[PDB]
Design an enzyme around this catalytic site. Structure first.
Site, PDB file in Angstrom:
ATOM      1  N   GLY A  27       0.922  -0.782  -0.123  1.00 18.45           N
ATOM      2  CA  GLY A  27      -0.286   0.249   0.121  1.00 18.45           C
ATOM      3  C   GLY A  27       0.734   1.318   0.320  1.00 18.45           C
ATOM      4  O   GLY A  27       2.040   1.382   0.408  1.00 18.45           O
ATOM      5  N   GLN A  31       1.929   9.461   4.350  1.00 16.94           N
ATOM      6  CA  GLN A  31       2.719   9.698   5.626  1.00 16.94           C
ATOM      7  C   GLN A  31       4.001   8.793   4.630  1.00 16.94           C
ATOM      8  O   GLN A  31       4.909   9.296   5.696  1.00 16.94           O
ATOM      9  CB  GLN A  31       1.918  10.175   6.787  1.00 16.94           C
ATOM     10  CG  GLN A  31       0.991  10.574   6.534  1.00 16.94           C
ATOM     11  CD  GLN A  31       1.036  12.496   6.364  1.00 16.94           C
ATOM     12  OE1 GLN A  31       1.781  12.678   6.967  1.00 16.94           O
ATOM     13  NE2 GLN A  31       1.095  13.086   5.604  1.00 16.94           N
ATOM     14  N   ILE A  33       5.460   5.072   3.482  1.00 19.21           N
ATOM     15  CA  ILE A  33       5.312   3.820   2.267  1.00 19.21           C
ATOM     16  C   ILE A  33       4.790   2.800   2.782  1.00 19.21           C
ATOM     17  O   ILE A  33       6.014   2.029   4.021  1.00 19.21           O
ATOM     18  CB  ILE A  33       5.953   3.900   0.996  1.00 19.21           C
ATOM     19  CG1 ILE A  33       6.115   5.042   0.450  1.00 19.21           C
ATOM     20  CG2 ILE A  33       6.256   2.387  -0.084  1.00 19.21           C
ATOM     21  CD1 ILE A  33       7.091   6.464   0.971  1.00 19.21           C
ATOM     22  N   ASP A 145     -12.099  11.699  10.284  1.00 22.68           N
ATOM     23  CA  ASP A 145     -11.481  12.065   8.693  1.00 22.68           C
ATOM     24  C   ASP A 145     -11.576  10.734   8.265  1.00 22.68           C
ATOM     25  O   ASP A 145     -10.061   9.543   7.850  1.00 22.68           O
ATOM     26  CB  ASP A 145      -9.703  12.572   8.368  1.00 22.68           C
ATOM     27  CG  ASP A 145     -10.155  13.120   7.022  1.00 22.68           C
ATOM     28  OD1 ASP A 145     -10.415  13.299   6.228  1.00 22.68           O
ATOM     29  OD2 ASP A 145      -8.378  13.196   7.246  1.00 22.68           O
TER      30      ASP A 145
HETATM   31  C1  LIG Z   1       1.747   0.399  10.989  1.00 20.78           C
HETATM   32  O1  LIG Z   1       1.159   0.771   9.072  1.00 20.78           O
HETATM   33  C2  LIG Z   1       0.551   1.331   9.713  1.00 20.78           C
HETATM   34  C3  LIG Z   1       0.434   2.272  10.749  1.00 20.78           C
HETATM   35  C4  LIG Z   1      -0.556   3.573  11.434  1.00 20.78           C
HETATM   36  C5  LIG Z   1      -1.190   4.571  10.577  1.00 20.78           C
HETATM   37  C6  LIG Z   1      -1.187   3.477   8.788  1.00 20.78           C
HETATM   38  C7  LIG Z   1      -0.515   2.147   8.490  1.00 20.78           C
HETATM   39  N1  LIG Z   1      -0.155   1.658   7.434  1.00 20.78           N
HETATM   40  C8  LIG Z   1      -1.110   0.490   6.743  1.00 20.78           C
HETATM   41  C9  LIG Z   1      -0.578  -0.432   7.831  1.00 20.78           C
HETATM   42  C10 LIG Z   1      -1.704  -1.649   7.158  1.00 20.78           C
HETATM   43  C11 LIG Z   1      -1.599  -3.481   7.254  1.00 20.78           C
HETATM   44  N2  LIG Z   1      -2.767  -4.111   6.377  1.00 20.78           N
HETATM   45  N3  LIG Z   1      -1.561  -2.738   5.087  1.00 20.78           N
HETATM   46  C12 LIG Z   1      -2.241  -3.972   3.963  1.00 20.78           C
HETATM   47  C13 LIG Z   1      -3.285  -3.527   2.527  1.00 20.78           C
HETATM   48  S1  LIG Z   1      -3.291  -4.840   1.813  1.00 20.78           S
HETATM   49  C14 LIG Z   1      -2.078  -5.643   2.314  1.00 20.78           C
HETATM   50  C15 LIG Z   1      -2.455  -7.059   1.514  1.00 20.78           C
HETATM   51  O2  LIG Z   1      -2.132  -6.884   0.717  1.00 20.78           O
HETATM   52  N4  LIG Z   1      -2.122  -8.133   2.518  1.00 20.78           N
HETATM   53  C16 LIG Z   1      -1.944  -9.505   1.613  1.00 20.78           C
HETATM   54  C17 LIG Z   1      -0.315 -10.327   1.363  1.00 20.78           C
HETATM   55  O3  LIG Z   1      -0.163 -10.829   2.429  1.00 20.78           O
HETATM   56  C18 LIG Z   1      -1.756 -11.069   2.197  1.00 20.78           C
HETATM   57  C19 LIG Z   1      -2.854  -5.361   3.338  1.00 20.78           C
HETATM   58  C20 LIG Z   1      -1.859  -2.313   5.916  1.00 20.78           C
HETATM   59  C21 LIG Z   1      -2.278  -1.222   4.610  1.00 20.78           C
HETATM   60  C22 LIG Z   1      -0.643   0.240   5.180  1.00 20.78           C
HETATM   61  F1  LIG Z   1      -0.466   1.310   4.453  1.00 20.78           F
END
Ligand SMILES: COc1ccccc1Nc1cc2cnn(-c3csc(C(=O)NC4COC4)c3)c2cc1F
Length: 346
Positions: A27, A31, A33, A145
């Site tokens: 993803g 803020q 990657i 938000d």
């Molecule tokens: C520490 O992170 C944060 C902390 C505070 C604020 C925001 C974040 N960001 C954030 C965390 C997470 C946890 N999961 N995902 C996820 C989305 S799609 C996917 C997937 O495709 N999983 C498949 C591959 O194996 C199964 C997994 C995230 C995407 C993120 F942008």
């Protein structure tokens, strides 16, 4: 001997601890990657987000310092928790990036909205959103938000909310998403707890319609799509506005608003059995209580958890959580650096 190593994921350099292997992009927000990886210490898959120099401006520093404190201050099954924080840099002078590690999920809520869901899974996801929201309120945190991009789910329908909301010039090409902000936020009127209920309504409506409920280039187009569908608000809501914004909104064309069976026809709902026919009406009823412009008439989080469409998942130990000061200020980029650096060192 170096306990760190660098991987090039896309265009960003991911320098993480040696415990994290097999980094893969999953993803990308605004803020930082995000990458998936295997934690060789905990023997599980994790998600690693890299904040590149969050002290570079006030907007990045205010948000980074906020969510860095709250994620060790608030815990919940529906609010994401911190697994590990680290920076590859050794001193405050060399300090550059912050890496946040959390439990890996399976998809974003945007990917789930694109899918067709039954009443069981739609009601369960909406139940988990209100559970984490009420824990935020129980801890004195109001979001304002909420959006699908900051909500992640697993294959077992478990849901978690990523960020903590608003507290702002942006020196970035990526634009922010405002389609889910309540009218009081659109017009700047002041809010209570139920300001997040509206954002739940736009999400719930999007799962049914598979289209953004109130799109627009700016707040000018957004408020139009609100009154063109819900109707022009009542005068009691009018007088609660500031005189400047009250004049502009009162000077807009008057709309009666479309009824909720028209905004959400039965053809968009599972309507083949009698049980499915009833749930379609209960869902539309929750849309009616949530998607209302006036906050005083808007349903609350506690009332939404007791709504017939939601309370089928009701469980006392799951709804509430213990309630766990106030660091809102304006600093320089050097002062913001030390404030964030010491939070990483904890
Ligand atoms: C520490 O992170 C944060 C902390 C505070 C604020 C925001 C974040 N960001 C954030 C965390 C997470 C946890 N999961 N995902 C996820 C989305 S799609 C996917 C997937 O495709 N999983 C498949 C591959 O194996 C199964 C997994 C995230 C995407 C993120 F942008």
């Amino acid at each position: 001997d170096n306990q760190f190593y660098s991987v090039e994921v896309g265009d960003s350099t991911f320098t993480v601890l040696k415990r994290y292997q097999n980094l893969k992009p999953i993803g990308s927000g605004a803020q930082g990657i995000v990458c998936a990886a295997y934690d060789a210490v905990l023997d599980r898959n994790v998600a690693i987000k890299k904040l590149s120099r969050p002290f570079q401006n006030q907007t990045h520093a205010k948000r980074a310092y906020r969510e860095l404190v709250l994620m060790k201050c608030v815990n919940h099954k529906n609010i994401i928790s911190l697994l590990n924080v680290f920076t590859p840099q050794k001193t405050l002078e060399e300090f550059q990036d912050v890496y946040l590690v959390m439990e890996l999920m399976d998809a974003n809520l945007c990917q789930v909205i694109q899918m067709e869901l039954d009443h069981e899974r739609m009601s369960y996801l909406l139940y988990q959103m209100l559970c984490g929201i009420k824990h935020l309120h129980s801890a004195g945190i109001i979001h304002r938000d909420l959006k699908p991009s900051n909500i992640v789910v697993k294959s077992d329908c478990t849901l978690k909310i990523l960020d903590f909301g608003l507290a702002s010039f942006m020196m970035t090409p990526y634009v922010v998403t405002r389609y889910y902000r309540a009218p009081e936020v659109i017009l700047g009127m002041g809010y209570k707890e139920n300001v997040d209920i509206w954002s739940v309504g736009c999400i719930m409506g999007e799962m049914v319609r598979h289209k953004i409920l109130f799109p627009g280039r700016d707040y000018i187009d957004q408020w139009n799509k609100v009154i063109e569908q819900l109707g022009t608000p009542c005068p009691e809501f009018m007088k609660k506005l500031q005189p400047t914004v009250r004049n502009y909104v009162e000077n807009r064309p008057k709309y009666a608003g479309l009824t909720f069976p028209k905004l959400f026809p039965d053809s968009l709902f599972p309507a083949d059995s009698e049980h499915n026919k009833l749930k379609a009406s209960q869902a539309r009823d929750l849309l009616s209580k949530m998607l209302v412009i006036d906050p005083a008439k808007r349903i609350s989080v506690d009332d939404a958890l007791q709504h017939p469409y939601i309370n089928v998942w009701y469980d006392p130990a799951e709804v509430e959580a213990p309630p766990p000061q106030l660091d809102e200020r304006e600093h320089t980029i050097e002062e913001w650096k030390e404030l964030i650096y010491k939070e990483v060192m904890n």
